[PDB]
Amino acid sequence: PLGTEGFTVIDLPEVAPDILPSYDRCPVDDYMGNGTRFKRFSQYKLTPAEDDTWSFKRLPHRDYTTYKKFNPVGGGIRRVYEPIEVDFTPLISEGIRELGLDRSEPWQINVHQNRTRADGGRPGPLTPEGVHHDGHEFVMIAILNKVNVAGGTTRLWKPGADAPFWSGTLEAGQAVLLDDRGLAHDVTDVLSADGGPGHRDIVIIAFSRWAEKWYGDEHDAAALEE
Amino acid sequence: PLGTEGFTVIDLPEVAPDILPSYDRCPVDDYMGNGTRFKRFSQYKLTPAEDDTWSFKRLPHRDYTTYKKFNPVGGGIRRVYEPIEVDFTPLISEGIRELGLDRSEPWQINVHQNRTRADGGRPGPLTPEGVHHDGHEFVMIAILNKVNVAGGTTRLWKPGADAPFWSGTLEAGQAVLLDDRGLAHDVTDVLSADGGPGHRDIVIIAFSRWAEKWYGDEHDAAALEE
């Protein structure tokens, strides 16, 4: 499973030819990033399959809801996103293999397909939450494309620490897997590499056991404090 | 001067008839509030005048810059805003009288004319910074108009405290004056009162001594970490 410090960085396999172009068709995120972020969102059930594989089932499309206690800037509201068009589940299966997810019960994943844009004088913020936990058990963050950007350095923190214990800029074709309970994280802003427009295209996958799923009326009521 | 707990709430005089309509002509804030906020911005030199009054001089229009250490979601960047069209200096004089601003040196003020909109299912965030200091010596927040909104409760905090020591919902025609060093503040989100659109129209005035002004090349370089 994960490295002893609670994270692993991996190389990603080649992706299908529809993945990178699909980022050009992500609409603006009306809730986060103040116009610098573009997003699609889908959720899946993840079940252990015989032959020691995993089965993915796309769930009916629902608004994204998270808790203010994890995300103070985007929590506590219904966030209406459009579904992801392409199939990230081959990519996600690489992360699962490295996580060694507990096969004794089913899992539920949130999948966020994000583009953040940077331009001269306007960095693209990646973690306006600051140093945070996502609220899930594991998180996978995969970088699919970077064009004309600098910055975007991932920092991993022990809870309460004054400084991160690991920093690294993930490049296209890399992913980090995180123990999202034991570690906190942030990412420095995306910067324009030369003064002109640039962008950073990623997918974030948040893993929870189905028994603790971030999906459905009970989760929504809890996250919205209803 | 201010109350012994570092703040005072005051009633405001009647304002000129052009002030309330001017909020309809404030452009969207491209940098904060994710489309829920509209803003104009101007800066003034503030000097003591004989017969125990104060004189205001509007300074050449410059981008707003603040520090990430005070504002993690809107700091560290050049924020290009349009100037304020109306004259808030009569209202600001009411706050100055209550502050008892030291007349032994000149001052510099930042003036933010803000509208935050709320709608059903979409609150209007007021302090995405969370509990914060603005970074100035004194702050005045004046409420000019509230239409069909709830929430928007000001909370004042001792430094490092885990709960506020005072809470109150400022109404149209009220202002709070704050010791921005000795106390921190936040405000709960603006909510739609009935499920439909509503808005809250305010002006924020941040006071610094001219010797510590938030204006000009040196300030900008420090706030941008250049």
Ligand SMILES: N[C@@H](CCCC[N+](=O)[O-])C(=O)O
């Ligand atoms: N904090 C990110 C989402 C990261 C994934 C967490 N999850 O699915 O709850 C956002 O609010 O857009």
Ligand SMILES: N[C@@H](CCCC[N+](=O)[O-])C(=O)O
């Ligand atoms: N934190 C508010 C500004 C409040 C006044 C503070 N000032 O002038 O620096 C914003 O970023 O829009």
Ligand SMILES: [Br-]
């Ligand atoms: Br944001």
Ligand SMILES: [Br-]
């Ligand atoms: Br914001």
Ligand SMILES: [Br-]
């Ligand atoms: Br002068």
Ligand SMILES: [Br-]
């Ligand atoms: Br009240």
